[PDB]
Design a protein around this ligand. Structure first.
Ligand SMILES: NC(=O)c1c[n+]([C@@H]2O[C@H](COP(=O)([O-])OP(=O)([O-])OC[C@H]3O[C@@H](n4cnc5c(N)[nH+]cnc54)[C@H](O)[C@@H]3O)[C@@H](O)[C@H]2O)ccc1-n1cccn1
Ligand SMILES: NC(=O)c1c[n+]([C@@H]2O[C@H](COP(=O)([O-])OP(=O)([O-])OC[C@H]3O[C@@H](n4cnc5c(N)[nH+]cnc54)[C@H](O)[C@@H]3O)[C@@H](O)[C@H]2O)ccc1-n1cccn1
Ligand SMILES: [Zn+2]
Ligand SMILES: [Zn+2]
Ligand SMILES: [Zn+2]
Ligand SMILES: [Zn+2]
Lengths: 374, 374
């Protein structure tokens, strides 16, 4: 009996940059054709959400952010075939339309229907399902998970195992899959290799997990916050370095440590300077560097192309290279079979209503992932 | 007999930047342990040699340049086991020491003994075999082929088929292998793909040869000199575009031509701006761009890392990614077995004494490869 009707619920609206979220009532329209309305159960706080607040990641405001989440289908629009009411789902911030050249390519995952490259903050049909104070509110990457209910396009949701613990598997919606995929699928880390991981947050820890899973012999965590080192070691870093401890630039320090440069490096921070540092620290003839961090809006890095000419490979990826709708349910199934751990990422749990405290935790450096429960 | 004696012979000496080569008598010392003295038969004029004249590529002066060549072993130093007097040989401007981490890596070819990264202009032992008017003259890339005789370290020479035509196979010493391997080995061009090739000189044409050999369905040549188009089509380009003919940036043109970006792009010129254009023109989620051209000394490019974050791969390579001493003899054998052609790269054959005229042809846009014959 909410099917076909507007739902009034609480969401965290961001009206302005650099301000707290406003927990307040919104109206959520029912799903149109090929849309899905989801009752949220749990959502994680990803740095990319914070980037919306800071202006690092530009997307139209006002907005309902959130993109790392899981919930339960409340209703489906006309013509939906891939989920039903009552299904456990994870919203897919990178869609999988299944029809575009990228979806059809064996390697590609950054589906042409994404709202990340040139964000509009809408549904696929260019409109919004959200009203607050009588004003339309933008969506974020097609997911908008900081709301008790959201509406997503069908291509931006995956059905997952009905017995899944949603307060854990929400991390498969972003941080875990992004970092793990970046190591295992994008870099294709090899047995016995030396890896350097720049940034030891939720995503960088997942990178580490991926490097360890792939059989790396050495995994060097790099962070200016030495509080991050203990957990990085727990999940597989063999050693951790703080650039602030050294007189020399850290690329030189890592090249020394690795007797001439690492096999694989990862930038999991979002700074221009560290993207160049991470490239430079990989071995000049055969090293691979993967950019994971989201850079500040519209800013260009500067680098010497001789870093590449010698033989380095530089690449980046969204969501760990995973084709999202195919991969997310498999990732869940693998989690249920204990093929990887999510608890090491979860440092704090809060009710949704304490979302701003969650953000304070991230900004302070204290948390890895805070999971909010609805 | 000349073995064990100083040879006085003719060479093309570059006394300073931006000046013609001086053709005159030099003295060539006999080879020391693990060194090989070669009588040159044919040497090609590569743009990288002109980059030494122009200061684009910094290496100590005065110098005997030249790196794309073939000749016949005159004598060997103590300890040499891989060639003997009378052998046809190609000097290897990228060595293969076989002991360094790079030589031992299955993909790597930029051996740590190279003189390209931090040019010293000497033999491996840090001395020179050349004197002219009483003055020591530097080596170039461990090769120095603009001389009737040179001396090279054993790791910088490969024995080739005794029946080889040296006036053709000299191109396996640089231009052909560099382009062909950039397509087949570094990019790993796939069947039915779309490729864009920036720069249609000897190296860009060889890239086209490789993209054709790998089964690309479309090969778009890009050059500002439309005189280069006819030969590019002969060797496999399906269409050629001149950026000066368009009101829009060529990346935009190529993206529209390829219905959302190319599978593989190659920068084969050596300009910072075209390196970025080439990257940008490959499909954002799965495209691969390879830098082949040698950029001007010490200059940085600027780019937006979102070009990589979406999924692009950017890489570069020296000498087509070929491990030099293993590959060069196989390449010559494949040529002898008609697996690829070299004649489409040769536009001019001059005596060595007309070296300057050969360089004027390159600079004027009139030639592809000029081969100088001793
Ligand atoms: N590519 C994706 O799909 C993607 C990208 N992001 C981006 O990854 C970065 C990391 O996110 P996080 O792990 O959630 O972030 P933090 O917890 O803040 O960890 C960062 C880590 O870096 C350290 N650090 C800061 N500054 C430095 C310097 N200078 N040196 C060394 N270390 C440093 C901090 O101390 C901290 O521990 C973010 O950029 C993020 O935006 C995340 C996930 C996905 N994505 C894309 C769209 C939505 N989500
Ligand atoms: N990576 C290596 O091992 C390598 C590198 N190089 C470098 O490749 C570039 C091409 O060399 P080339 O084919 O010998 O050069 P040209 O015959 O001059 O061809 C260039 C081609 O480019 C066109 N052009 C100029 N400007 C433009 C613009 N703006 N748009 C499009 N086209 C443009 C010209 O008209 C001309 O047709 C060089 O940088 C070279 O250094 C070669 C070989 C090997 N190497 C490494 C060490 C030694 N040799
Ligand atoms: Zn798609
Ligand atoms: Zn995220
Ligand atoms: Zn070596
Ligand atoms: Zn060359």
């Amino acid at each position: 009996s909410t099917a076909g009707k507007v739902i009034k619920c609480k969401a965290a609206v961001l009206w302005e940059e650099k301000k707290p979220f406003s927990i307040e009532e919104v109206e959520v329209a029912p799903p149109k054709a090929h849309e899905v309305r989801i009752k949220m159960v749990a959502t994680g706080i990803c740095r990319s959400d914070d980037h919306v607040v800071s202006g690092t990641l530009v997307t139209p405001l006002p907005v309902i952010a959130g993109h790392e989440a899981a919930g339960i289908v409340e209703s489906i629009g006309e013509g939906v075939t891939t989920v039903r009411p009552g299904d456990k789902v994870i919203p897919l911030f990178t869609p999988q339309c299944g029809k575009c050249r990228v979806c059809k390519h064996p390697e590609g995952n950054f589906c042409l229907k994404n709202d990340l490259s040139m964000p509009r903050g809408t549904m696929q049909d260019g409109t919004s399902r959200f009203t607050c104070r009588g004003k339309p509110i933008h969506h974020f990457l097609g997911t908008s998970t900081f709301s008790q209910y959201t509406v997503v396009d069908e291509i931006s949701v995956a059905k997952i195992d009905a017995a899944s613990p949603l307060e854990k598997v929400c991390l498969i919606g972003c941080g875990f899959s992004t970092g793990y995929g970046s190591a295992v699928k994008v870099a294709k880390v090899t047995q016995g290799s030396t890896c350097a991981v720049f940034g030891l947050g939720g995503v960088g820890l997942s990178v580490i997990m991926g490097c360890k899973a792939a059989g790396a012999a050495r995994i060097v965590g790099v962070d200016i916050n030495k509080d991050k080192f203990a957990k990085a070691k727990e999940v597989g870093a063999t050693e951790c370095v703080n650039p602030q401890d050294y007189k020399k630039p850290i690329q030189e320090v890592l090249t020394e440590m690795s007797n001439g440069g690492v096999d694989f490096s990862f930038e999991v921070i979002g700074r221009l300077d560290t993207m160049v540092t991470a490239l430079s620290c990989c071995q000049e003839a055969y090293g691979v560097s993967v950019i994971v961090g989201v850079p500040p809006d519209s800013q260009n890095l500067s680098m010497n192309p001789m870093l590449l000419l010698s033989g380095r490979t530089w690449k980046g990826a969204i969501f760990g290279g995973f084709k999202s709708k195919d991969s997310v349910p498999k990732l869940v199934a693998d989690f249920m079979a204990k093929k990887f751990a999510l608890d090491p990422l979860i440092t704090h749990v809060l009710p949704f209503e304490k979302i701003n405290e969650g953000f304070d935790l991230l900004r302070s450096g204290e948390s890895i992932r805070t999971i909010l429960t609805f």
